[PDB]
Each structure stands twice: as C-alpha cells, then as structure tokens.
Amino acid sequence: QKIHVGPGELDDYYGFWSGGHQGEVRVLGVPSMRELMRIPVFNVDSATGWGLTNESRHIMGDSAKFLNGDCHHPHISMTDGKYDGKYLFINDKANSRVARIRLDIMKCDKMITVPNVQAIHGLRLQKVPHTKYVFANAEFIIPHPNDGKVFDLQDENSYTMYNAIDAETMEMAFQVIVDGNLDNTDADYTGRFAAATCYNSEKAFDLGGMMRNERDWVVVFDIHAVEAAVKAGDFITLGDSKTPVLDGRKKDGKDSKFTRYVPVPKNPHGCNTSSDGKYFIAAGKLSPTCSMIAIDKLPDLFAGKLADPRDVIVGEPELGLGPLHTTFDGRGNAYTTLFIDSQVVKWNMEEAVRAYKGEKVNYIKQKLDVHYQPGHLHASLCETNEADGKWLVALSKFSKDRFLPVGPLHPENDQLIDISGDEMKLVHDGPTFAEPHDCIMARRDQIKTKKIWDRNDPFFAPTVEMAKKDGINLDTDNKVIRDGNKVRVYMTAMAPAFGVQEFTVKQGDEVTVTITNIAQIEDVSHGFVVVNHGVSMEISPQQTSSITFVADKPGLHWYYCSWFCHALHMEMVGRMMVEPAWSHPQ
Amino acid sequence: VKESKQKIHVGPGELDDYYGFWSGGHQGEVRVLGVPSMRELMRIPVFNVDSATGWGLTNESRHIMGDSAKFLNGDCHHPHISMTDGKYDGKYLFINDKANSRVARIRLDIMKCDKMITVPNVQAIHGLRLQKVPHTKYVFANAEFIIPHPNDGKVFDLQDENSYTMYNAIDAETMEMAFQVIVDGNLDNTDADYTGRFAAATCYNSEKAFDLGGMMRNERDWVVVFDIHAVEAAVKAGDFITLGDSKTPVLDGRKKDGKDSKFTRYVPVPKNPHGCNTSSDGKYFIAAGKLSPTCSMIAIDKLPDLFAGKLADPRDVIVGEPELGLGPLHTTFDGRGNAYTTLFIDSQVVKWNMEEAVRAYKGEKVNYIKQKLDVHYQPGHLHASLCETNEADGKWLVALSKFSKDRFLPVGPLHPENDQLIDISGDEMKLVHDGPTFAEPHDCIMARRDQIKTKKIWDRNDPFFAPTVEMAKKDGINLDTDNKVIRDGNKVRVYMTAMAPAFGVQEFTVKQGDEVTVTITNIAQIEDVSHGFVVVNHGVSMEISPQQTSSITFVADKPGLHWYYCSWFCHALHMEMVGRMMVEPA
C-alpha cells in the first residue's frame, strides 16, 4: 500500500479531523496526513473572517457571541449505509451546538444551539435509508427548568436528553428524556434503532459517585416508536422550545415505549456499530471489556420476548486495560483502543461471540503498541457497509518524546496504521494541535467540491437580498449607499484593484463593506482588511462577502487585499476617509 | 561533484533535524514545524483568538495584548529569530501584524507570545527583521502606508508635507519603542548588516501615489539605507521630536531640497523593488527587482564612504545587477557563495553565484546563473536553513508558492499555499516535498534542533502569569496549595489547584450577574499532563499546563446550574473531571 505521496501525486482519501477544543474542522489528505484546508466552525478565523463577517454571524445566530467551541465527533451523511458526501456534521461540547458543513464548498452552512441541554458530546448519523436524523447526546444532567430554584441532580425534574436534529433543515426533530446521562452514540443499518452509552447512571456529581455502580448501560432507542408518538401528538414541550419531548425514563421499574436499558460495565464510553450491521459494541473503559449488543435481538427485547435486557448481549470479550473505542475492517475483525495499556487490539467479533457461549477460543489476533494513551480510532469507511479494511488512524493523547520538544504543551499523536493485511503495521506519526478526538475518512471519489461559487448560493443569499433593497446589482455595481449614520459600500473585486478605491464617512458611522469577487478563474481569492479596525475577510471567485464595523477613528484609514493574488498584490489597496465628529452635528 | 541526497523520511520514533517557524499569514498565529518531515508540531497563538488555550480570552493573554485585545484578527508575514554575534541564540521570535499595526515577541523556551506592541503613529507593520551584530538589540519594522500627521481628519492629502510613513526600531528586550525615522516614499521589506551600523529597506512607492498606475510610474524606486549609529547619536543628544501622545524619539530621514539627512541615503534601484536580503557573508544588501527582471546588490562595505560624502553618486554602492528572470521577489543564501531567488512570473527558483554576478556587472563574460528549478506555482518568499546567520549551512530550502492549483486534492473554492522543500546540499537543487498550508504563511525561518531549548514544565516565577500571582498575593492566596472562593461585592475570585482527575474546587455558588474570575494552578510535575477549563454555554475556555497558573473572567448572567469540565484529555477518568457553578437568581 502506497505510504508516501510525492510531489505531484495526490492522496487517495480525504480525512476530516475534529479540531477538538480549538473549534474548527481540518481537511487532511490520506495517507500523506498533510492538512489541506481548515474549515472554521466554532472558532473565529482571522483569515476568512468567519465569526466577523455578516454571513458567518448569520449562520451562528446568537451564539456568534462565543469565540470558542469544543468539537469531537465529525460524521459524513449517508444514503443506504454508504457515504453520499453531501454534509459533515460535528458537535460542540462547550456551547451545546451542532454544526453542518457543506462538503461542496467546504464551509459550515448551518448551526443550531440545542435547546434545554448542556454539552453536546456524542454525535452520529442515521445510516438507513439515509441520514434523515443527526443524533446527539447532551452529556450533563441539569434541572428543568434550570432557573436557580433547584440544583439537585436527584430531583425528578433533573435529567439530560437524547437529541435528534433534522439533517436537511438543521432544526430540532425531537428530544428523549433518559435516566442517567449520555456519552457516545451510534445507529443501526435499518433506521429503527439508535444506541448510546451512559456512565453516570448514579446521577452523581463527584468522582466516587459516578463510579459507584458496577454497571451503567447502553440505552437503546426505538426511533419508530418515537416518531409514532410525535405524529400522534403524544409529547410535551420544555420552556420556550417547540421541540417535541418524549419521556424515555423508567417509571417504577416499568420501561417506556421509547427506550430499553442494557446493563453494561463500567462507565462505558465508545458506542460503535459494526459495519455488517450486526452489533452495537460498547467499550467498557473501567471494565477491561467490550459488550456486544446483537441488533437483531432488539425487536424481541422491545416486545417483552426476552426475560432480561442482558439477553441482547452476545459477547463481552476481555481485551485489556481501558477500552475506549472500536472500529471495523469489514473482514469480521474489530479494532479497539486500550487507553491504559496504550495499544490497539485487533479481535474477531464472531469468535468473541462463540467464546461468550463457553466455546474456548482465542479471539484476540494482535496487540499493537501506540504512543501514547489512545482515545478514538477510525478505519477507512468503517461507518458504512463499504468498510474497506485499508487504513486505520489511532488518535493518542500523550505524545511525550515522539516529536521534537515544543514547550510544556505537547501535540497529540495520530498514528496511521496499515491494516490491509493480517498484521497491523505502524507507518506514520502525525502530530496535531488541540486534541482531535475522532476523525473520518472518505474515498477521493466520494467528495465532489466546487471551484467557483454559484451566484445564488444560500451562504450569502441574505446579503443579496439586502443588496436588492438598495437597488444594487452585485455583479456590476460599485456604489456607496448612505442611510443616516449607516454606510453600505458595494463593490466588485478583480485583481489587482478594488472597484471602490476610496470612500468618505462621518466619525461614528456604521460601515458595511460588501465585496463581490467577479473573477471566473480558480484559486483567485481576494481579501479585505481595514487597518487598525479589526476587520478581515476572504472573497473567493463569484462569492459575495460582507462585514460591518464602526468608523470610530477620524482621519485616513487604509484598506488592503490580504490574499496574495498577483504580482501587484502589494498594490491592491484603498482608502476610507473619516471626517471628524467635531465637524458634524453633535 | 557533490550530489543532493539527504533523507526526508522521518519515521515513527525518529525526530526532525530542524525546527521550522512558519508565519500564520492572515490567520494570525505562528506555527512550529519539524523539518524535513514538514509536519506541524505546535500552534502558537499571537493575533488570533485560540479557543483551545484561551489566548485572547484569559487574563494573562489579554494583559499581554493590552488594548489590542479587542481585535480578533492579525495578518502575519515575517518571522525572525534573535541573534548574538550573527548566529541564532534561540531566545525570541518576532513577527509583524499588518492588519492592526503590531509587533509580537514569542519566547522560544515556552513557545508563547510574551510581549506585544502597537507601533504608534503608523499604519500596517509589514517588513520586519532583526539586528544581527553584536546582538538583536533592535527589531526593525516597516510601516507600509503613508498617512497624515496628525491623522485627525483635517488633511487627507497624501502629498501633504506632513503625510509620510516611518521606519520603526523596537527595543527587542523591553518591547518598547526605541525610535522612528521618517522616510520619503513607502517601505516594503528590510534587513540589517553584520556590524550593527546599517540597515536597509526597499521602497516601492517612492511616488507617494494611491493608485496602481501612480505607484508604478518611477523607473526606479530605491533602497533606503539607515545609519543606525547616527540615529542613536541624535537620540542620545536629544535631537529629535515626538509625534502626538507617543514619547518615541522621531528623527527626520527625508531629503530636504535635495539635501540628504544624516540618517539616510537613498540608493536608486528598479523597480518597485521588493525583497531586501542580507547575504550571509555580510557583503551585500540584495534587493529583488520585481517589476525589473533583476536583483540589485549593494556593497555594504561601500556604505561608510556613501554616508561620508566620499562617493560621487549613490549608485556607486551598487556592485551587481544580475538579470535573472521574470518577477524576482526574494533571495536567500546557502553559505557557499550562491544566492537563490524566487521568480514569481516564471514560477522558478534561480540559483546564482554572487561574486560572478559582481564581475559580470564590471563587463566580464561570465555566466553566474547555475540552475533554474520549476516550482508550483508563483513563489513569493524562500528560505534556506540558517540563511540569516554567518552559519548558513546550505542544506534545506523552502519556497513558499501562492497558487497550488492541482498539486493537492481539491477542497472547494479556497486553495492551500504550496510550501515546497528543496534539497540544496549538493550541486543541483532537488524538489523533495510539497507542503500544503493554510492562510498563506508568507515566510518561514528554520533553526537547528540544538539552537532551541524549551521548558518541559513551567517555572512558578514565570513573568507570563506574574500579574496573576500578584493578584493572588493581594487576596492572601498561596496558588500552590489553596482552594478558596473570595467574595468582593459582585466580584467572585475562585482559586483552585488542579490534578488529574479532579478540580481542587468542584462546586461554587454565585449571584446572577456576579463577575467571576477562575484562577487554576496545575500542580502536576509530570510532563505533558495538561488540563483544561470550559464553562458550558458561557464562552469560557483555557489551557493550564504543568506548573502553570491561568485565569479567566466572565459574567454569571444565567441563573441555575452550569457545568464546567476539563477540556484536555488527561486521565482515564477525564470525562468525570467536572464541577458545578450554581447561580442564584436575582
């Protein structure tokens, strides 16, 4: 398997890395492991202006006031259990959001703050018949309402919820109240079932409390039952949110129609659907095991045909210390990170099942040392029925001595491992910033990107509507619109000249600058920076972008094009002249 | 005969040979790479807001940024490492911000920005380089754009006698201004000699024009040479003025009725010259012709005669003007007598011999051009290892090219820069690696592994958080031991230690509207065991590495229970390293 990509060669896969607490999404080439692009999401990007521009702040909504995010879990939309390459979704644990990235323009195009919850952690997508729902875990138990009268996690109105978002509209679809809490989640290959791990069945807030129970569980959701209750109007709402809320808690030991709780040791973490659709596999973490839930026993479980929820468990292999996550080669082997033992363990799922029935058999095939303390791992196409068994990435949390010293803060070590054969082979150590937790790979032919924007793209359609009210034709006009103490500058941009090279305003005016890059070539980006005003944005071919700032300083203020576009790029500049306040009405 | 055949593969467990410090371009950070692997080992936030470490959110970072903490953007170009006796000493890295007119200093032992200055009475810090000999006493910085003085909105005319820009000298060690020199025209790039007496800067806008045609009118602009000794003498004698409310000594380096200043000489050089690079043998200031297909070589040892009025014509210090190709922008050196220049139009690196160019300028028929290597595409800066020092080792060359086109997988309308690693150890340049990068790093600098020495854990006396230690002292707090909540009206100052896997303060209660400061001291002594702190749905995030104290301030504006958690995976029980803020309603 080609390991190195030389000058002029292309990578064979796209990799989409979470940015962790840095808040962006990163696009890598695999197997070179080089970063090809950064996609700002919850971070503020000085380069493109994401978080500064009107278009990006419109997408972020009120959450544009936050300059931080914490993302863990990127996933690609699917149709019939295969990537369709339309969208990538990712969580924000810090400010309780889900974001959608359009993979044709490689930008976040939608973002939602999940109502009535704290901390969106686990996230994964419906596989079949396609990604109708984005499933997302809120990790922390809170009071409802959370108005400061009740703080007790044991109150009957303290709980967290499972969250389903409509992938296409990026509006909430429903929420399910659960017992305990929620960690990671995955979905089956039928559309009926989803599952999530819980580690705080104790509803405690201290370390010892959260470890009290020998088993927590994975909670299984019957989405068909949830949808049926929603259509029937059998739901409630919380606070000011219209999201249908269904109650998936037990009451007096009796199960709800929406959930079943399978006892699983212990503070389990990863929750991974095998690529043959057979199992939800939960990583035992504090228990040295994984628990294998037979998806084809779930209908019987929900129909009272089983005596004990544990009856849906058909394997519980002992693997090593600190199992966190599992992935799949598509040849019937699973791969699990051992955080404490600092290894990846390769094991055969069907032999673990046979061992659980007492048939003594060694289901462990190999243990590979990684460096060090691995969290997530990802095999190429593992989340689809096309799992190809070629590449594996294990994302480790302590790199110690594997890279040059760079001070007290160390990079992470994401190691690329060749799994095309019987023996796992460590091939590359990839240092990364800010703790990517998880990543996802896609074949090159599964991603189709645009090189020039469409003029009707929804990303800036609101800006086009604003332009229309001013009588502006964005493709041709270079005009300064005045409206009280607001100034709206509309210009075209074409290397190496701004279409409006100077304009004059009053001190204190609120200035919006809208720029349309009227170029037709590829890779001809322009920028716009106003010196000493904290103003910066990108405009790529056929894109319209805009930004708003207050001209709070009298005098002459230069603006310039930031994106090197030309031999005369140093010279693509303009001037904003600000008349002093003492010369205008006080 | 000697071949170019260095290894570029750095396998698992092997370490890079050099550090690379890349500018973050319009994204605003500095990036630490390993060379020759070209992998990114660390990101150092400077002018960007970093969600991961909290740079731009924490009190320590906003203290360093001062009032400029209000800006969320920067635009970097030119990273340089401090020198002693013309060799890198590994103490500091400096970098410019063109967007908000700043210079930042990075401490290379902790890999953090530790000082920042907004340069007074200028717009757009672009060109930047360090004094070499006897050490980096001054940071020299170009303000690119001509502005009115004062810039109070009375005069906008850039031809006015009080419209100009200035050359800036910052005291490298105190990061206070040392002096400014008014110049004719504008300033592009700058470098310094190997004695401390002279510095020089290219000027592309000798015309003081605002339009593209106006800026290209003069057949020749110049490089302006500064007699720094003469500037220092005048400051010591008190022969200076000050501008506005800045105490910075200001010297007038303009020509007056054709009469030269004591501080400057203007050497005519074609055309809109751009790069300004000092050869590693200290013989030449080499100015790249850009619009002229040449480089101009200024003999540094003729400059004393120039300033003494011993030379008939300022062109007499020009001793070479090789013709190289289309669009020469920047030059670097292998220490063997060759220069390497980027040809932006021809899209090449041209290797040429400086002493042979000097002889050609006298009329000898000698071919000084050795090789032209195609690069991909449109190179700007380039950098050979240790080129800025008398130890230039002739091993590696990076050319930083602005259009990557088809050299990487497509990733939408925006494309990465192509930073290409070239083996120059032998007679033939050899292209060995294409490195995609984000946001146009413009330039980079390399250092031997043994020139950089970093701390593995923080010193408790570190100036970086000394103001926080002082705050703690005023509250009677011992940061190494204490877990306490101080109440001060509507202000709450929480102080806690942190150790995997538990915050030293796991709950605290405040009043809605209180201003909360959380100060955390990581009392681990194990390398690489960093913790984080995130307050859910409050926009609060920061890093605390071993023995560091970090603090962050936010308003508790939402009643109810609000979770905080450790963002840095630190322990098998990382998910459970959490606490609760309880906010009582008003």
Ligand code: CUZ
């Ligand atoms: Cu958020 S957890 Cu194992 Cu996913 Cu990192």
Ligand code: CUZ
């Ligand atoms: Cu700022 S310019 Cu040729 Cu240096 Cu990039």
Ligand code: CUA
């Ligand atoms: Cu437009 Cu550089």
Ligand code: CUA
């Ligand atoms: Cu401290 Cu994770």
Ligand SMILES: [Ca+2]
């Ligand atoms: Ca538990």
Ligand SMILES: [Ca+2]
């Ligand atoms: Ca000129």
Ligand SMILES: [Cl-]
């Ligand atoms: Cl998982």
Ligand SMILES: [Cl-]
């Ligand atoms: Cl230069």
Ligand SMILES: [K+]
């Ligand atoms: K780490």
Ligand SMILES: [K+]
């Ligand atoms: K570019």
Ligand code: NA
């Ligand atoms: Na939205």
Ligand code: NA
């Ligand atoms: Na300062």
